[PDB]
Structure formats: C-alpha cells, structure tokens
C-alpha cells in the first residue's frame, strides 16, 4: 500500500545520487590538467 512512498523515495534519492556522482566525475574529468607550465614545453 505504501508503493507511492517507497517508489518516490528510491527514485529521487537515486536520481540525486546519480546527479551528484555525475557532477563530481565531470568536475574531476574536466579538471584543469595542472601542467600548463609543461603544455608549452612538451608542445
């Protein structure tokens, strides 16, 4: 009988967690490479 409650809890909790993981992985993947002092030396 509580299908609405658990469905919404799980759906939105997991959507929020997935969004947080995606945002963190994008902030790390698109992190500044950090060797800008070396980009112009290697290239």
């Amino acid at each position: 009988l509580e299908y609405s409650v658990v469905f919404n809890l799980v759906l939105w909790i997991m959507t929020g967690l997935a969004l947080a993981v995606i945002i963190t992985s994008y902030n790390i993947w698109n992190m500044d490479p950090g060797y800008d002092s070396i980009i112009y030396r290697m290239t």
């Binding site: 002092s37 112009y40 030396r41 290239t43």
Partner: protein, 350 residues
C-alpha cells in the same frame, strides 16, 4: 539569438558605459578643423586643451616636440586601456588580452631582433609598446641567447600558442623578422576570430566584420608590397589570414597574383573592396590605398557602436583612439614642417 541583453550588464555593463563615455571624448570633425587652423605646436596644445585631452600636455616642457605629443597620447591611451582592463572580468578580460596581443607580437619581434644582433634585452624594453609590456621576468636577463628567449616566450607569454606556427627556435635565425611577424599576426588574427565567433551573439556580429576586413586588407597589402621582393608566392600565401571574405578562391587568386592590376581584378569581385580600390588613385595628391583602407576601418569601428550588448565596443574604441592619436601626431607634423597643404590627410572620426 544569444540574448546578450539579459546578462551582459551583470559583469560588463559598467565598462560598456565607461568605454562609450570615453568614446564620446574622441575629437569630432570640428575639433579636427580647430586643430588644423593652429600655427604652432604650442597653439596646438592650446586648442587641444579645450577637448577631452585637457591638461595631459601641460606638464611637459614648453618647447614642445612631435615626439613628446605622440608619447603623451600613447601614454594616455595606455592608461585608459589598462584602467578598463583592471576592472574587467574573465570574458572581457580575455577579449582585452587578445587586443593587447597585437602589440605583444611587435614587441616580441623587437626582442628577438635585438637578441640576434646581440643587444641587451633590458635595453630594448623602453622601445616596446606599453600595451604589450612583457611584465613577465622569464623573458628578461636572457643573456642574449635566442634559444633562451624562445623558451621564455613559450613558457611565460600568451604568444606560446601563436609560436606553434613555427617549428623550432632555429626559425628565429632562419626566417626574416617580417615573415615571423606576419605569421604570428596571422595566427593571432585567426585565434581572435575564433574567440569572437565562440562568444557569439552581438559580439560576433559586431566584431567579425572588423576582423574580416583586417584579414582582407592584410592579404591585399601583403600581395601589393611583396611584388618586387624575394618573398615567393608560395611563402606569401602563408601570410594571408583565413578569416577574411576572400578565403574561397580569393586568397588563392591573390597568391597567384603577379601585378597590382591582378590584385585590383581580384578585389573587383567584392564591391566593398572594389570601391576602396577605385578611390585609391595612388598618384600624388590623392588618397592612397592604405588611406582608403584606414577610412573603411574607421567606418567599421564607428558602426561597431550601433550595437549595445557586445565587447566589440572596446576593440572599436581602442582602434578609434589609436587613429585619433595618429591624426593628432600628423597634424603636429604638418604644423612643425609648415606643410599645411596636406594637413587635411587626417582621417576624421565622428
């Protein structure tokens, strides 16, 4: 559309207003006539004090010289641009940096020319354009080593991106300084055009025409000036920027060009350039091709002010004030040399 109206003024509205206020201070035609009617450089300063310039020249020595006036004008322009830059945010800051790259490209050429001829780099800074000052210390105390200077440029100068058009530091001693300068300017112009296009909106609309004309005039004048020189057509075509409106088959035809008549024929396909070439009689006593291109450049910069929410206003103001400083220096030269006849050759603005 990009709707720059909604968010432009968040970071750049104050500077938009400020640069438009500065542009309001560019000498009008009436002020140019007033300055033209002067008899002596002292009278030129007197008539100039009533304009926006004010007392920029009162401190200097009473026996004025054209060099002093030019230096003061350049200093005022540099101060205004630096003040605008210091108050600008990331996108507009990058735009103004791109504006300064144009002078950094000449300054680095001066540095390499001095280093190859074994003159102290520290002694070349005074002759560099202030707007392209190499405040970085990596390119100083180089000990007159071209390789060290090239490494310094690559490491601690925004020109590192444009120096990848070259292949090695040996090119500094291989290619003529003019070819190096023109290749750097081609790369810089292409980067500037790409940046402006990426900005999009009113910025791209009001700035791409100016860069396109810059590329086209670069192509035309590189073709015209290189006819009698050892600069081969294959090496000449490398100096044509690809931003212009001549890119499809226009730049190629210019590269194949072998005479001014052929350059005029190439320009004929474009009415806006056809008119400039037609008006450039080039015989003594009438406007030359460079003067016609200056008039068109001034026209484009002036039209850049009909848009509101864009960064092209800053580039337009910088170029318009550069032309105004050149006009004032020209008037001072005509006054000093008593050559009143050509005193009308200044290009009016507004």
């Amino acid at each position: 559309s990009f709707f720059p109206e909604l968010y432009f003024n968040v970071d750049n509205g104050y500077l938009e207003g400020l640069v438009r206020g500065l542009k309001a201070g560019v000498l009008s035609q009436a002020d140019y006539l007033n300055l033209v009617q002067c008899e002596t450089l002292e009278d030129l300063k007197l008539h100039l004090q009533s304009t926006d310039y004010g007392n920029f020249l009162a401190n200097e020595a009473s026996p004025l010289t054209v060099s002093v006036i030019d230096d003061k004008l350049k200093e005022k322009m540099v101060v205004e641009f630096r003040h605008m830059r210091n108050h600008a945010y990331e996108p507009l800051a990058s735009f103004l940096d791109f504006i300064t790259y144009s002078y950094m490209i000449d300054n680095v050429i001066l540095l390499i020319t001095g280093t190859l001829h074994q003159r102290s780099i520290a002694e070349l800074v005074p002759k560099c354009h202030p707007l392209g000052s190499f405040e970085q210390m990596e390119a100083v105390n180089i000990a007159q080593t071209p390789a060290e200077l090239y490494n310094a440029i690559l490491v601690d100068t925004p020109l590192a991106a444009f120096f990848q058009d070259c292949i090695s530091e040996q090119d500094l001693d291989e290619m003529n300084i003019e070819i190096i300068r023109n290749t750097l300017y081609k790369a810089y112009l292409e980067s500037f055009y790409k940046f402006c296009t990426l900005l999009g909106g009113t910025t791209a609309d009001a700035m791409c025409p100016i860069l396109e004309f810059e590329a086209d005039r670069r192509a035309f004048i590189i073709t015209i000036n290189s006819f009698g020189t050892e600069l081969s057509k294959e090496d000449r075509a490398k100096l044509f920027p690809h931003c212009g409106r001549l890119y499809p088959e226009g730049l190629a035809q210019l590269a194949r060009a072998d005479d001014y008549e052929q350059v005029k024929n190439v320009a004929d396909y474009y009415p806006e350039y056809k008119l400039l070439f037609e008006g450039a009689g080039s015989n003594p006593g009438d406007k030359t091709l460079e003067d016609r291109f200056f008039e068109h450049e001034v026209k484009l910069n002036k039209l850049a002010f009909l848009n509101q929410f864009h960064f092209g206003v800053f580039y337009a103001f910088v170029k318009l004030k550069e032309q105004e400083c050149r006009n004032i220096v020209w008037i001072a030269e005509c006054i000093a040399q008593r050559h009143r006849a050509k005193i009308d050759n200044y290009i009016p603005i507004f």
